[PDB]
Amino acid sequence: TTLDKDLREKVVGSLVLLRRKDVIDSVSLLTTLFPILISSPSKSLRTLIYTKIISDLRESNAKATNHKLNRTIQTVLHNLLTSDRTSSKGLWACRI
């Protein structure tokens, strides 16, 4: 919330770059990005985090279907919907 916008999208892009360089894992990157995606007030931050999540899923399932990763993310989205029906946070899982 409190960082500058350019610095915070640089941090997100650098985390995605470290995932590309295989320093960190896809599960670690997604568990970092997703609560910030659902709880961030910044529209640009939410848009870029959503774009990076979609790009990470595409790059993971491009060479072969990663059933474990898909199952974990689907379970996470299902829990997000199941936790609070009246909340509007499920639209991110819907868009994904």
């Binding site: 919330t1 007030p41 609070d84 009246t86």
Partner: protein
């Protein structure tokens, strides 16, 4: 790493048309240490002064211009109940599993949240009950009639009660409306005290079980809000002059203790610990952290500010909530073991029913057996092992 959390509430319309701050959110739950953040939000609430209560299961929020208390489940994080109390609400506190409500007509309401039983005292206060403090044996109700009444909980709440409830004592040395009440954590007959702040620019330290006035303090401004430090050494008061003062019980000139002067002698406090700017506003609510080194003040311009007594004379703004902050209550960083959990609440109802208690029984390990030692002991116990060997042979 212990995490210190506090709960904030707002009242009234938003001060500025800012789309960043959500309009419908009433109650915020934050973190104070190590970094400020907003954990959770509760919507559709406008809480006046002294109408917020919090416990590990629920948040109780009395409503401005309504005779409603909103009950919020923290475990489920949502609106659980809309409790409609029969007559208007001015203040409320929570002491265990009972909500004590001071009303605007002078009545006192005791609502057991687990059994759904409501006890209504007769209107011994001829105007509105402004402040209510509670200890597990006493209830102190200070009202706008310049009167403070002391009640016994065991006398207020019992089974098969038909007699009208009468206060044990009345403390009426003030000359104006009682703004605030605080009570020392002690419960002994002679070591306890209570500090009462009224609109006659005075705070009186009383011994409420004996009904004796221990000390009288005069401030340039009448105290809007007032809180004792955790170790019962000092009082922090805000004033209408936007200034915050501190009074020490046991200093070089002690207010209480053997070295203190006569009770009839009145001490004047004129040295300001801190002050807030005119555009900030006087501190509407005050709260003290667990260690007691830090204070949080809520001001009707919407900002929550932190005071560090040792380090910073000037307070530091944490955030601006765009609406008048009326209550700040701290949550203890340690978890407390309680044999019952109040998962669901029971609404107040007037009907002929048997006295029923509704709570989930927590596992407190009250039952112990000899096999429990073998179960929780690493390896086998020596005596049980040799007994097993002998009975095998």
């Amino acid at each position: 790493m212990l995490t210190e959390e506090f709960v904030s509430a707002i009242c009234g319309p938003p001060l500025s048309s800012n789309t960043a701050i959500a309009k419908d959110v009433g109650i915020y739950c934050h973190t104070l240490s190590p970094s400020y953040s907003v954990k959770s939000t509760f919507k559709k609430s406008s809480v006046p002064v002294n109408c917020l209560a919090v416990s590990d299961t629920h948040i109780f929020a009395g409503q401005h211009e309504k005779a409603y208390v909103h009950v919020y489940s923290r475990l489920r994080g949502n609106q659980e109940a809309f409790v409609a109390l029969p007559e208007r609400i001015r203040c409320l506190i929570l002491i265990g599993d009972i909500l004590v409500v001071g009303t605007t007509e002078g009545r006192l309401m005791l609502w057991e949240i687990c059994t759904g039983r409501l006890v209504s005292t007769p209107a011994r206060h001829v105007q509105a009950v402004s402040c209510v403090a509670a200890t597990p044996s006493h209830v102190l109700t200070g009202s706008d009639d310049s009167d403070i009444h002391v009640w016994s909980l065991s006398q207020l709440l019992e089974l098969d009660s038909a007699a009208e409830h009468e206060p044990l004592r009345t403390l009426a040395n003030h000359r104006a409306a009682i703004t605030a009440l605080a009570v020392s954590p002690s419960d002994s007959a002679d070591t306890n005290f209570c500090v009462s702040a009224s609109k006659d620019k005075s705070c009186i330290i009383w011994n409420y079980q004996t009904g004796d006035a221990l000390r009288t303090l005069i401030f340039p401004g009448y105290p809007l809000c007032m809180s004792l430090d955790p170790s019962s050494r000092a009082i922090f008061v805000s004033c209408e002059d936007s200034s915050l003062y501190v009074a020490e019980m046991f200093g070089e000139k002690p207010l209480l203790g053997p070295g203190s002067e006569d009770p009839s002698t009145v001490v004047q406090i004129s040295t300001p610990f801190g002050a807030t700017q005119p555009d900030v506003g006087p501190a509407s609510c005050l709260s003290v952290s667990y260690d007691g080194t830090m204070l949080l003040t809520g001001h009707p311009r919407g900002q929550i500010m932190r005071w560090d007594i040792s380090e910073n004379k000037s307070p530091v703004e944490l955030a601006n909530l765009n609406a008048a902050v009326t209550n700040l209550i701290f949550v203890s960083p340690f978890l407390t073991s309680k044999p019952t959990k109040t998962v669901n609440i029971i609404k107040p109802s007037q009907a002929e029913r048997a006295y029923t208690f509704t709570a989930q029984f927590e596992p407190m390990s009250f039952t112990k057996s000899r096999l429990d030692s073998l179960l929780n002991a690493t390896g086998f116990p020596a005596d049980a092992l040799e007994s097993a060997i002998v009975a095998f042979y």
